[PDB]
């Protein structure tokens, strides 16, 4: 639907959804805080996501600024659903049992998650 | 110096979940189980078994004159790690974010909800 998307694309997309509008050079800067990717490798991620229809762009200055054409929450939920079907036999509850049985969740985190369920 | 880290493809997960369910399974046991749900060939399936063996995820003992495959990886550990990477890739690292987006979007009757409450509290 909001179709396939690779690990490195998730990173570009995440920067865009958080910043709302971002230039190439912005994306390169943030990406490069945690990744040793060259500008060309990054610029090619922007190019594909633009071609695939995931993001678009306005020309503020003579400078292109990219923005999402995909709803963040929709593509993340769909992705999570493919993932849960792939790994955990199609059960979200299995995922949570696994996580909880294994992380040493702090009381604040426990409470937050309670607050999340209790919101209907 | 630990062995090379690998990702597991969707079709490798189908194989590994059969291995974990059966504890010990031959190539023929796996082929048959897989074919019940999927139209993949014997060659295809043996290719997945071979890839997982080469990757270190599974090994084999010869009972009778027949290879029997078993996991080298604890199921809950590997699925947790896989979940953590996936949360770090998609959700900025917030498990809370994944749970949130999933409650905002599924239609959950409150008996789905409760077993989650009890996964928390218990
Ligand atoms: Cl699209």
From Swiss-Prot, chain A:
Spans annotated as Important for dimerization: 71-120
DNA-binding region: 4-68
InterPro entries: BlaI_family, WH-like_DNA-bd_sf, WH_DNA-bd_sf
Site (Cleavage) location in chain: 98-99
Keywords: Antibiotic resistance, Cytoplasm, DNA-binding, Repressor, Transcription, Transcription regulation
Pfam family for this entry, one: Penicillinase_R
Keyword Transcription: yes
GO MF term (any one): DNA binding
Any GO BP: response to antibiotic
UniProt superkingdom: Bacteria
GO CC list: cytoplasm
Record's subcellular location: Cytoplasm
Post-translational modification: Upon exposure to beta-lactams, proteolytic cleavage at a single site impairs dimerization and abolishes repressor activity.
Task of the protein: Transcriptional repressor that constitutively blocks the transcription of the gene for the penicillin-binding protein MecA. Binds DNA as a dimer.
Family (UniProt): Belongs to the BlaI transcriptional regulatory family.
Subunit structure comment from the entry: Monomer and homodimer.
Protein name stated in the entry: Methicillin resistance regulatory protein MecI
Natural source organism: Staphylococcus aureus
Biological classification of the source: Bacteria, Bacillati, Bacillota, Bacilli, Bacillales
Protein encoded by which gene: mecI
């Amino acid at each position: 639907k909001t179709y396939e998307i690779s690990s490195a694309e998730w990173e570009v997309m995440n920067i865009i959804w958080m910043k709302k509008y971002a230039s190439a050079n912005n994306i390169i800067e943030e990406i490069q805080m945690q990744k040793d990717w060259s500008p060309k490798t990054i610029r090619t991620l922007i190019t594909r996501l633009y071609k695939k229809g995931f993001i678009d762009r306005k020309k503020d200055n003579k400078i292109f600024q990219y923005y999402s054409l995909v709803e963040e929450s929709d593509i993340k939920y769909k992705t999570s659903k493919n993932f849960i079907n792939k790994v955990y036999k199609g059960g979200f509850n299995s995922l949570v049992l696994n996580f909880v049985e294994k992380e040493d969740l702090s009381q604040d985190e426990i409470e937050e998650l309670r607050n999340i369920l209790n919101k209907k």
